[PDB]
Design a protein around this ligand. Sequence first.
Ligand SMILES: *[C@@H]1O[C@H](CO)[C@@H](O[C@H]2O[C@H](CO)[C@@H](O[C@H]3O[C@H](CO[C@@H]4O[C@H](CO)[C@@H](O)[C@H](O)[C@@H]4O)[C@@H](O)[C@H](O[C@H]4O[C@H](CO)[C@@H](O)[C@H](O)[C@@H]4O[C@H]4O[C@H](CO)[C@@H](O[C@@H]5O[C@H](CO[C@]6(C(=O)O)C[C@H](O)[C@@H](NC(C)=O)[C@H]([C@H](O)[C@H](O)CO)O6)[C@H](O)[C@H](O)[C@H]5O)[C@H](O)[C@H]4NC(C)=O)[C@@H]3O)[C@H](O)[C@H]2NC(C)=O)[C@H](O)[C@H]1NC(C)=O
Ligand SMILES: *[C@@H]1O[C@H](CO)[C@@H](O[C@H]2O[C@H](CO)[C@@H](O[C@H]3O[C@H](CO[C@H]4O[C@H](CO)[C@@H](O)[C@H](O)[C@@H]4O)[C@@H](O)[C@H](O[C@H]4O[C@H](CO)[C@@H](O)[C@H](O)[C@@H]4O[C@H]4O[C@H](CO)[C@@H](O[C@@H]5O[C@H](CO[C@@]6(C(=O)O)C[C@H](O)[C@@H](NC(C)=O)[C@H]([C@H](O)[C@H](O)CO)O6)[C@H](O)[C@H](O)[C@H]5O)[C@H](O)[C@H]4NC(C)=O)[C@@H]3O)[C@H](O)[C@H]2NC(C)=O)[C@H](O)[C@H]1NC(C)=O
Ligand code: CA
Ligand code: CA
Ligand code: CA
Ligand code: CA
Lengths: 5, 5, 296, 301, 308, 308, 74, 74
Amino acid sequence: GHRPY
Amino acid sequence: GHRPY
Amino acid sequence: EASILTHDSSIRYLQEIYNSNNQKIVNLKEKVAQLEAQCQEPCKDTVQIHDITGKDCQDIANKGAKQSGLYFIKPLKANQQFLVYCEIDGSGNGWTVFQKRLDGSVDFKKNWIQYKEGFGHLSPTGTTEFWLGNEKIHLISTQSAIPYALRVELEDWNGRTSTADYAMFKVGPEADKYRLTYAYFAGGDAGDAFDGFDFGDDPSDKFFTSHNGMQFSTWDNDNDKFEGNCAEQDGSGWWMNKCHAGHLNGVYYQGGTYSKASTPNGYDNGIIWATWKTRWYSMKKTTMKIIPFNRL
Amino acid sequence: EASILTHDSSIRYLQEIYNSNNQKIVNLKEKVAQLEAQCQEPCKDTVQIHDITGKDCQDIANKGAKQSGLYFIKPLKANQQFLVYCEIDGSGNGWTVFQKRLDGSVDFKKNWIQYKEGFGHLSPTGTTEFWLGNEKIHLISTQSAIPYALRVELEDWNGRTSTADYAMFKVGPEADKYRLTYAYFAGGDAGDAFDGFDFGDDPSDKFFTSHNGMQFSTWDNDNDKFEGNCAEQDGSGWWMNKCHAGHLNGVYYQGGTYSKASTPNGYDNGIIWATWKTRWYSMKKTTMKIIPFNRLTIGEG
Amino acid sequence: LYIDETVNSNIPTNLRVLRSILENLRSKIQKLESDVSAQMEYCRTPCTVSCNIPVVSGKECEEIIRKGGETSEMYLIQPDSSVKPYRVYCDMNTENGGWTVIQNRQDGSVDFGRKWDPYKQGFGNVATNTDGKNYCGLPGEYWLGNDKISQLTRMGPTELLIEMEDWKGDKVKAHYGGFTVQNEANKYQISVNKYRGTAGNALMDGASQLMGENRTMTIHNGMFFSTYDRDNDGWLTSDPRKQCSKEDGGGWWYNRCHAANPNGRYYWGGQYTWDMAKHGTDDGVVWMNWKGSWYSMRKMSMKIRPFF
Amino acid sequence: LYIDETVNSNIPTNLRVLRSILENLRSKIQKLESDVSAQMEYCRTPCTVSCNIPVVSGKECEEIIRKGGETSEMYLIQPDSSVKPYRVYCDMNTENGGWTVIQNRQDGSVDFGRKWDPYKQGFGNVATNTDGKNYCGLPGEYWLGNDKISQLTRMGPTELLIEMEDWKGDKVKAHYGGFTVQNEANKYQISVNKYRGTAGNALMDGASQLMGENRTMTIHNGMFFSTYDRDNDGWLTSDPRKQCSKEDGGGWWYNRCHAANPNGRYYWGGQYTWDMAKHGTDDGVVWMNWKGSWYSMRKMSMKIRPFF
Amino acid sequence: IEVLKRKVIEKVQHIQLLQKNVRAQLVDMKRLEVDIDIKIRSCRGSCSRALAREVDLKDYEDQQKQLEQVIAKD
Amino acid sequence: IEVLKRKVIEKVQHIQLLQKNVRAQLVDMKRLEVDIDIKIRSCRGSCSRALAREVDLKDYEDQQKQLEQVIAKD
Ligand SMILES: *[C@@H]1O[C@H](CO)[C@@H](O[C@H]2O[C@H](CO)[C@@H](O[C@H]3O[C@H](CO[C@@H]4O[C@H](CO)[C@@H](O)[C@H](O)[C@@H]4O)[C@@H](O)[C@H](O[C@H]4O[C@H](CO)[C@@H](O)[C@H](O)[C@@H]4O[C@H]4O[C@H](CO)[C@@H](O[C@@H]5O[C@H](CO[C@]6(C(=O)O)C[C@H](O)[C@@H](NC(C)=O)[C@H]([C@H](O)[C@H](O)CO)O6)[C@H](O)[C@H](O)[C@H]5O)[C@H](O)[C@H]4NC(C)=O)[C@@H]3O)[C@H](O)[C@H]2NC(C)=O)[C@H](O)[C@H]1NC(C)=O
Ligand SMILES: *[C@@H]1O[C@H](CO)[C@@H](O[C@H]2O[C@H](CO)[C@@H](O[C@H]3O[C@H](CO[C@H]4O[C@H](CO)[C@@H](O)[C@H](O)[C@@H]4O)[C@@H](O)[C@H](O[C@H]4O[C@H](CO)[C@@H](O)[C@H](O)[C@@H]4O[C@H]4O[C@H](CO)[C@@H](O[C@@H]5O[C@H](CO[C@@]6(C(=O)O)C[C@H](O)[C@@H](NC(C)=O)[C@H]([C@H](O)[C@H](O)CO)O6)[C@H](O)[C@H](O)[C@H]5O)[C@H](O)[C@H]4NC(C)=O)[C@@H]3O)[C@H](O)[C@H]2NC(C)=O)[C@H](O)[C@H]1NC(C)=O
Ligand SMILES: [Ca+2]
Ligand SMILES: [Ca+2]
Ligand SMILES: [Ca+2]
Ligand SMILES: [Ca+2]
């Protein structure tokens, strides 16, 4: 689970 | 030694 | 026609049961936080370490300490304190045991190193077979010019225990193979077994089974007065010579009393205290305390 | 006539000198008794025996005593005390030597019984070869549970000396052939010759010339680790093995040092201490003391 | 036009559904209340565990084994003279034997969603009993004190083993012959290199299920340690709500946010969807690389040991 | 009526006799005065002797020899646990060897005319050096303690040897496999029996140069010990001047008086008449049975030893 | 006069938003099931005992479809 | 008339007794020669040195005959 821009 | 009487 | 205005009157029930739902949920999520905080602690470990680290257990009782459990100590010469099950009789003395025998299952057929660093496990209660470790015992009796003592306590499968005190007790550094030596034998209703009890074989024994001055041997380290790596011949470690005349690290024979046949090869060993019981009678409980000489 | 009246006057002279004689004699016999008393005493014996009998010389020096002469001690275990030349260095210690070698005229080629009872004589000055006695030595090193130590001090025809101390020293009972056996080797600038010195013959020696645990052997008593009674071969008594690796009772060779040819058969003996001087170098002075471990000698002070 | 008739036909059917769904919840809820209340009562009496401290000791686990430590139970160590000896769990079996366990999961027995201090100090149960036997050979989930963990590594070369397994049994792991976490003064950084083993280099190469900016933003290596009590993530944003640690409940070396989330939310079964996560993210101990963002392991462990 | 002329002829020759005789004496005495004066000056610095005590020790000489006592020097024994050990001389060569010398004469180096006490305690020189040699091999004349002599004999059977020799060399001796002197309480009686050897059984058979009452009164066997300090002789007389001991200066088991006088007046040369004796009797170490009432030995010695 | 075409749609709005609110309830609910379940487990390393209970995801997703079956068509 | 026969013998008694007096002196003296000698030897086991000296018994008994040669004279 990553946090995009 | 002896001794007479 | 318009008559159906009745069903919409059903809506109240849904919205209402719904609110009750949303409401309880907040009251419920609210209680969950209470649980996370209430129910989020490490289990309780019966075993506890006490502070007031000292030179030895006798300092701990010198610096207060009235309970009997495990403490940390750090001798002057060395460093890096360690654990040591003490024994405070409250009378104002705090024994420091480095070897205790009970249960029977712990084994002492460990190599040299294993004996250097001890083995087994200590316990607050005091019921658990263990062997501090030649290194520990060394430094504990080598610090300062203050003499020490040893109280070899034993008990038969009867119930009657005996004692044995030896003054100036102290084991040298590993450099000398942890040679064990003292000055004399104090009291002891168990008898002086470290003197060399001559059972009945050869005019030797006496001048062969004594342990004052000997070194330490193990299944893989022979430093005894016999090429015979005794430990192999037996099944433990000690300051052999003829060998044992009272070494209490051998096998723990359940119920005490054993024969020449009970061994794989046909020799003898096991917790025996010559000057107290037969060369063929295994103990039930053992223990080696140590306190500086001035304590009595 | 009546003229002769003169010779009679001469008599006065005789009774007068006779009177002097008798009077003088009385005064003389008188001085005689004065002489009998004054001069009538046993010779003055330079050798003297002190008191304060104890357990050993260290207990003597523990109950006063400061002089280095002969005293009496009586071990707990045995009975009947016996003379024992001490050696109180005054520091507060009192050794109790059981063997000494100087002169060289005293001999050691003595049988068994002779060694069990000791031979030679003891002296105040402390100059006279002698071997206490296997029996005494035992009773001394065994009494109580107190360990004893030994200091094999020696000296060369140079003048320098070396010591050797061993802990837990102590000789078994006759029943075991006064077996010698200690614990470990302490200090000593003379070398551990009791540890068996492997001169240079066979991978043996080291595990053949050590005297730790050996029994005592004599000209007519063999209790060593070799069939050939070393005694007879050598000419002494010791705790033989391969044999001696430093025994110090062999013949006292004048001047020190000797050859394999100086002996009838061609063997070697004499007070030697492998770990210090060649196997062919006899000593000039020897001595074996003994004090309980607890004492100064690698103990305290 | 006449479109009205559809009201008596459509609205009712929905009313039936809502009634079913809504009423089903009320009971569903009263059901939970009973549990929470009940479980609550249980924690009024904590668990008891007794662990006889072995006599044998040393600095780490490596020393112990080379000191006669064959059995794999909890020991007592002291990697420094200026620090109190503590308990720990030594694995003396897995590969060579002598690994110092630093963290472990296996049943969710202890929640890892703690504040910062707990993670600095250390929490969990070092070890539990072994079915009667006086000593403790069984693990039990925990996380030894950070300061210790840092202090451990910063005193000689070290390496790490991160084994794990799904609910199918299949096991895998990572190996870094170079592990080092910095002191509390440096937000407990984590400089790991020298990868090995098979499972996914999701600790220094980011995640495999991504590419470019998406992937290179999930490398734990060189990051700081964050907790929902203190944010040190690589996620730069002002919304207090948006923080790696708060999203995926738990302390870790997050970085917007993870490629692997040990110390997460130990879920059951093994699988789970977004509509279950506490925040709606993908919390819970997941390696993702070996399995995927939607799969919390059955067992997750880490252990250290010197390089030599 | 003329007999007077002889006064001038006879008296003069007489005055010549007294003059020479008397004058000869005034000088003989002046000669003695300087001697006693000079000798007196001598014992102002007593004799020195260094006797190193041999290590080997026992109760009597018998034991010592069977304990490696070869050489015949003096030794130190302890016939009893309740008695101070004392030096003594042990003969280890004469007849089997191992005799405990109790009395010995050879040069009169010491006066035996001592009182009673000196006789109970002991006196003389036990042994002297051997010309340079550190130990004491040579005897020295003495008389060990009576109390010891008695104690010795009263603890087991005993025998006695009394050798001696004239000034010609000829040697002889007496043997008594039965010897026993009571304790001071009983005046050190002396009950000896079982004679042997050749020299004269005068100790229980009385002299040989006598007959009847004359001889049968000189049997020492059974008598008490007397000294000119205490009279215990078999001579009953009130005149304190008439006492065996005084007559013949020296403590012995007298009895009106002797047939043998050990411990007497060591006369030189060997022969001596009545007009020499201190009292005008027959004092001096003489056995009479082998020599005569007028022959002082050259070497008189006694020695005891266990029976069996 | 307003009775002909009007009464039909003007009235449905109250149930419309409510129809959406229940969904938001399910989901907000579904997580409780989970979070609570997970939290219960944390009580093993603390609470003497731990309550054992089954979590039903099925029923939820099942009811979800019912809510999803009734979307836009009014 | 007291001069003829009387003066001869009445005067001799002074020397007659003295004559007997010396015999005792010699005898008493002789014993001293012996006693002394014997006593001197006593110092050997007490006095540093021993004064060795011969004792002349010949001279005495030689003078004893002069005394014994002048006996019955009256
Ligand atoms: C047990 O042993 C004793 C020995 O101790 C022995 O004693 C006997 O002594 C004599 C000798 O047989 C006997 O005396 C009795 O019988 C005599 C019979 O008459 C004649 O005797 C001669 C020789 O015997 C025959 O040949 C004739 O045929 C004839 O029968 C009789 O003489 C005796 O008379 C005396 O009676 C009493 C003593 O019994 C006495 O008081 C009277 O004076 C009277 O005179 C005689 O005795 C005195 C004193 O005892 C003598 O006088 C002394 O003379 C000496 C002179 O020198 C000598 C010496 O006597 O020869 C030399 C010695 O060698 C020397 N010895 C010493 C002491 O070292 C000394 C020394 O010179 C002096 O000490 C220093 O001067 O003495 C001396 O001057 C004395 O001072 C002086 O007093 C006379 O010698 C003598 N008469 C004369 C002039 O010749 C009497 O009846 C008995 O047989 C018996 N007497 C006793 C003591 O009982 C026993 O017989 C014997 N018994 C047995 C068998 O067991
Ligand atoms: C690095 O990472 C970043 C991000 O991690 C990557 O960013 C990418 O983001 C998108 C990823 O999907 C990409 O979208 C593109 O591709 C879409 C795929 O479709 C293509 O194929 C079809 C084939 O028929 C074709 O018709 C179509 O033309 C495409 O070619 C495509 O759909 C995208 O089009 C969009 O264009 C723009 C955005 O660029 C918008 O204006 C349009 O609306 C259009 O739709 C998109 O936007 C929708 C509206 O916002 C989204 O939709 C769904 O929205 C859901 C929201 O609904 C709830 C809610 O809360 O309201 C309801 C419910 O509760 C729940 N659903 C349930 C029950 O599951 C969801 C749920 O909570 C969330 O899913 C949680 O995550 O929320 C919901 O979000 C759902 O998931 C959406 O599908 C939707 O985002 C999108 N439409 C669809 C159908 O996908 C567009 O062309 C981009 O390419 C890319 N970003 C861009 C534009 O640069 C990045 O790719 C990566 N880079 C790399 C390579 O490293
Ligand atoms: Ca062996
Ligand atoms: Ca042999
Ligand atoms: Ca952030
Ligand atoms: Ca009388």
